[PDB]
Enzyme design. Structure first.
Site, PDB file in Angstrom:
ATOM      1  N   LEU A  22       0.831  -1.205   0.000  1.00 32.86           N
ATOM      2  CA  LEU A  22       0.000   0.000   0.000  1.00 32.86           C
ATOM      3  C   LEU A  22       0.862   1.250   0.000  1.00 32.86           C
ATOM      4  O   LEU A  22       1.956   1.243   0.550  1.00 32.86           O
ATOM      5  CB  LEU A  22      -0.925  -0.007   1.210  1.00 32.86           C
ATOM      6  CG  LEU A  22      -1.538  -1.385   1.478  1.00 32.86           C
ATOM      7  CD1 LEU A  22      -2.473  -1.343   2.686  1.00 32.86           C
ATOM      8  CD2 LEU A  22      -2.249  -1.906   0.234  1.00 32.86           C
ATOM      9  N   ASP A  63       3.239  -5.864   3.010  1.00 34.12           N
ATOM     10  CA  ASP A  63       3.476  -4.766   3.943  1.00 34.12           C
ATOM     11  C   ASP A  63       4.118  -5.214   5.258  1.00 34.12           C
ATOM     12  O   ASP A  63       4.398  -4.387   6.131  1.00 34.12           O
ATOM     13  CB  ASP A  63       2.170  -4.014   4.207  1.00 34.12           C
ATOM     14  CG  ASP A  63       1.772  -3.123   3.048  1.00 34.12           C
ATOM     15  OD1 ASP A  63       2.554  -2.197   2.710  1.00 34.12           O
ATOM     16  OD2 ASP A  63       0.676  -3.356   2.487  1.00 34.12           O
ATOM     17  N   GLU A  68       5.970  -2.121  13.410  1.00 35.80           N
ATOM     18  CA  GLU A  68       5.451  -1.249  14.451  1.00 35.80           C
ATOM     19  C   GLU A  68       3.937  -1.160  14.405  1.00 35.80           C
ATOM     20  O   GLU A  68       3.283  -1.116  15.439  1.00 35.80           O
ATOM     21  CB  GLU A  68       6.042   0.140  14.338  1.00 35.80           C
ATOM     22  CG  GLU A  68       5.130   1.222  14.836  1.00 35.80           C
ATOM     23  CD  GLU A  68       5.840   2.524  14.868  1.00 35.80           C
ATOM     24  OE1 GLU A  68       5.712   3.278  13.889  1.00 35.80           O
ATOM     25  OE2 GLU A  68       6.577   2.776  15.843  1.00 35.80           O
ATOM     26  N   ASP A  69       3.373  -1.162  13.204  1.00 41.47           N
ATOM     27  CA  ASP A  69       1.927  -1.033  13.045  1.00 41.47           C
ATOM     28  C   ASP A  69       1.108  -2.137  13.722  1.00 41.47           C
ATOM     29  O   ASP A  69      -0.050  -1.928  14.052  1.00 41.47           O
ATOM     30  CB  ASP A  69       1.575  -0.914  11.562  1.00 41.47           C
ATOM     31  CG  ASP A  69       1.919   0.454  10.995  1.00 41.47           C
ATOM     32  OD1 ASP A  69       1.855   1.450  11.754  1.00 41.47           O
ATOM     33  OD2 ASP A  69       2.247   0.539   9.795  1.00 41.47           O
ATOM     34  N   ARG A  88      -3.786  -6.225   6.161  1.00 46.74           N
ATOM     35  CA  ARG A  88      -2.583  -6.361   6.981  1.00 46.74           C
ATOM     36  C   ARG A  88      -2.808  -7.090   8.312  1.00 46.74           C
ATOM     37  O   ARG A  88      -1.882  -7.229   9.104  1.00 46.74           O
ATOM     38  CB  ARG A  88      -1.969  -4.984   7.262  1.00 46.74           C
ATOM     39  CG  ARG A  88      -1.514  -4.206   6.031  1.00 46.74           C
ATOM     40  CD  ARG A  88      -0.633  -3.037   6.442  1.00 46.74           C
ATOM     41  NE  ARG A  88       0.406  -3.466   7.373  1.00 46.74           N
ATOM     42  CZ  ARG A  88       1.142  -2.651   8.128  1.00 46.74           C
ATOM     43  NH1 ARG A  88       0.967  -1.342   8.066  1.00 46.74           N
ATOM     44  NH2 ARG A  88       2.050  -3.150   8.949  1.00 46.74           N
ATOM     45  N   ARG A 135      -6.649   5.306   9.859  1.00 47.54           N
ATOM     46  CA  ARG A 135      -6.407   3.913  10.235  1.00 47.54           C
ATOM     47  C   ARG A 135      -6.620   3.595  11.726  1.00 47.54           C
ATOM     48  O   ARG A 135      -6.879   2.446  12.081  1.00 47.54           O
ATOM     49  CB  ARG A 135      -5.014   3.471   9.770  1.00 47.54           C
ATOM     50  CG  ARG A 135      -4.863   3.456   8.252  1.00 47.54           C
ATOM     51  CD  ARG A 135      -3.580   2.777   7.836  1.00 47.54           C
ATOM     52  NE  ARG A 135      -3.500   2.612   6.389  1.00 47.54           N
ATOM     53  CZ  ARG A 135      -2.613   1.836   5.764  1.00 47.54           C
ATOM     54  NH1 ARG A 135      -1.718   1.143   6.457  1.00 47.54           N
ATOM     55  NH2 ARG A 135      -2.631   1.748   4.438  1.00 47.54           N
ATOM     56  N   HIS A 163      -0.184   9.288   9.426  1.00 46.48           N
ATOM     57  CA  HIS A 163      -0.216   8.822  10.800  1.00 46.48           C
ATOM     58  C   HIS A 163       0.332   9.894  11.698  1.00 46.48           C
ATOM     59  O   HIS A 163       0.954  10.860  11.239  1.00 46.48           O
ATOM     60  CB  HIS A 163       0.614   7.566  10.984  1.00 46.48           C
ATOM     61  CG  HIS A 163       0.018   6.349  10.356  1.00 46.48           C
ATOM     62  ND1 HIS A 163      -0.226   6.253   9.001  1.00 46.48           N
ATOM     63  CD2 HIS A 163      -0.351   5.160  10.892  1.00 46.48           C
ATOM     64  CE1 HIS A 163      -0.735   5.062   8.734  1.00 46.48           C
ATOM     65  NE2 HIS A 163      -0.819   4.378   9.864  1.00 46.48           N
ATOM     66  N   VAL A 258       6.675   3.781  -0.121  1.00 45.30           N
ATOM     67  CA  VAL A 258       5.449   3.159   0.384  1.00 45.30           C
ATOM     68  C   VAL A 258       5.118   3.564   1.827  1.00 45.30           C
ATOM     69  O   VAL A 258       4.541   2.787   2.579  1.00 45.30           O
ATOM     70  CB  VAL A 258       5.465   1.616   0.213  1.00 45.30           C
ATOM     71  CG1 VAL A 258       5.637   1.269  -1.257  1.00 45.30           C
ATOM     72  CG2 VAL A 258       6.559   0.950   1.072  1.00 45.30           C
ATOM     73  N   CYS A 264       8.665   2.497  11.906  1.00 43.16           N
ATOM     74  CA  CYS A 264       7.757   1.439  11.470  1.00 43.16           C
ATOM     75  C   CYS A 264       8.438   0.085  11.383  1.00 43.16           C
ATOM     76  O   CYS A 264       7.781  -0.951  11.432  1.00 43.16           O
ATOM     77  CB  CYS A 264       7.146   1.733  10.099  1.00 43.16           C
ATOM     78  SG  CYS A 264       6.849   3.431   9.685  1.00 43.16           S
TER      79      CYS A 264
HETATM   80  C1  LIG Z   1       4.865   3.487   9.618  1.00 44.35           C
HETATM   81  N1  LIG Z   1       4.461   3.456  11.030  1.00 44.35           N
HETATM   82  C2  LIG Z   1       4.508   4.806   8.902  1.00 44.35           C
HETATM   83  C3  LIG Z   1       3.042   5.217   8.984  1.00 44.35           C
HETATM   84  C4  LIG Z   1       2.743   5.440  10.460  1.00 44.35           C
HETATM   85  C5  LIG Z   1       3.675   6.514  11.033  1.00 44.35           C
HETATM   86  N2  LIG Z   1       4.071   2.436   8.946  1.00 44.35           N
HETATM   87  C6  LIG Z   1       4.275   2.355   7.491  1.00 44.35           C
HETATM   88  C7  LIG Z   1       3.266   1.347   6.907  1.00 44.35           C
HETATM   89  C8  LIG Z   1       3.414   1.252   5.388  1.00 44.35           C
HETATM   90  C9  LIG Z   1       2.422   0.273   4.758  1.00 44.35           C
HETATM   91  N3  LIG Z   1       2.654   0.202   3.297  1.00 44.35           N
HETATM   92  C10 LIG Z   1       0.994   0.780   5.021  1.00 44.35           C
HETATM   93  O1  LIG Z   1       0.482   1.506   4.132  1.00 44.35           O
HETATM   94  O2  LIG Z   1       0.456   0.445   6.104  1.00 44.35           O
END
Ligand SMILES: *[C@@](N)(CCCC)NCCC[C@H](N)C(=O)O
Length: 272
Positions: A22, A63, A68-69, A88, A135, A163, A258, A264
């Site tokens: 994503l 992804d 961290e997510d 995810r 999100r 975010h 991305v 993350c």
């Molecule tokens: C980190 N934490 C950046 C956004 C939150 C600060 N997560 C990246 C996630 C990237 C994936 N491709 C997604 O879209 O979830």
């Protein structure tokens, strides 16, 4: 002690990421991202001497590298989240396993109306800031609030399909790294009104470059992994004034394509 960690959970990126992850730009170089994430792992593990648990890439989940997510961890308590992106959610399975090996207290966000990205959670060491974003929702922060009772939790409207931690992160005790953009400055102030105490602020010209990793390493002190003078030169210049910090520039250009920032790609864990 704030930013003191002994372990870190990371996860290899699948080949499917370049095409299938994503986003919201250039074509991703997977070879380059690959390398970069390797370096990133070595800084934490080899250079900084944390025990790293490396999870294997699930091609199925492009992804999956952004660990961290999927979990927030505080003291001995693991919150396994319910990610905003439906697809995810199959990434939690493998993270729960690992957090169970670490003999950590697990709480699973199973509530079907509850979404939460770890990317939206700023933990100051004194309290919790959760961003209300595309999100992460009320029902999720409430459950995050409910999981970490010893700490105050407050919510900051994050808009623009981002975010909370896209424009900030902790760069030391009481120190909050922060972007110049009006979006960030807005949440920034919004945040302070809500605290029983004033935070110091590290301001940087590039919103993205306010996402960094602060660490308190044994017999090393203040440690900050931050974006390079190449990617973000005017922000690097600001970090360069931190003369009590062991500054380690860590490139992350590919993954940024991305929406992958520094925080993350790991979950940090302080163990007795
Ligand atoms: C980190 N934490 C950046 C956004 C939150 C600060 N997560 C990246 C996630 C990237 C994936 N491709 C997604 O879209 O979830």
């Amino acid at each position: 002690a704030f930013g003191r960690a002994t372990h870190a959970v990371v996860r290899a990126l699948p080949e499917s990421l370049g095409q299938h992850a994503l986003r919201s730009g250039e074509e991703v170089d997977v070879a380059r991202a690959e390398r970069q994430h390797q370096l990133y792992v070595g800084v934490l593990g080899s250079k900084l001497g944390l025990q790293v648990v490396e999870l294997p890439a699930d091609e199925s989940l492009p992804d999956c590298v952004f660990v961290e997510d999927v979990a927030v961890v505080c003291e001995e308590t693991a919150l396994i989240t319910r990610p905003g992106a439906p697809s995810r959610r199959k990434e939690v399975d493998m993270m729960k396993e690992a957090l169970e090996k670490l003999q950590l207290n697990i709480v699973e966000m199973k509530d079907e109306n509850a979404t939460l990205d770890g990317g939206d959670v700023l933990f100051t060491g004194r309290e919790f800031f959760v961003g209300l974003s595309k999100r992460t929702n009320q029902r999720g922060a409430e459950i995050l609030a409910d999981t970490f009772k010893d700490y105050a939790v407050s919510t900051v409207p994050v808009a623009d399909g981002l975010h909370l931690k896209s424009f900030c992160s902790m760069a030391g005790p009481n120190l909050i790294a922060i972007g110049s953009s009006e979006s960030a400055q807005k949440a920034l102030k919004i945040m302070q009104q809500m605290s029983d105490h004033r935070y110091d602020k590290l301001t940087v010209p590039d919103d993205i470059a306010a996402n960094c990793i602060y660490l308190n390493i044994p017999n090393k002190g203040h440690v900050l992994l931050h974006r390079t003078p190449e990617e973000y030169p005017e922000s690097a210049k600001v970090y360069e004034k931190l003369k009590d910090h062991m500054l380690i520039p860590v490139s992350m250009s590919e993954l940024e394509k991305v929406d992958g920032l520094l925080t993350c790609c790991s979950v940090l864990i302080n163990k007795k």
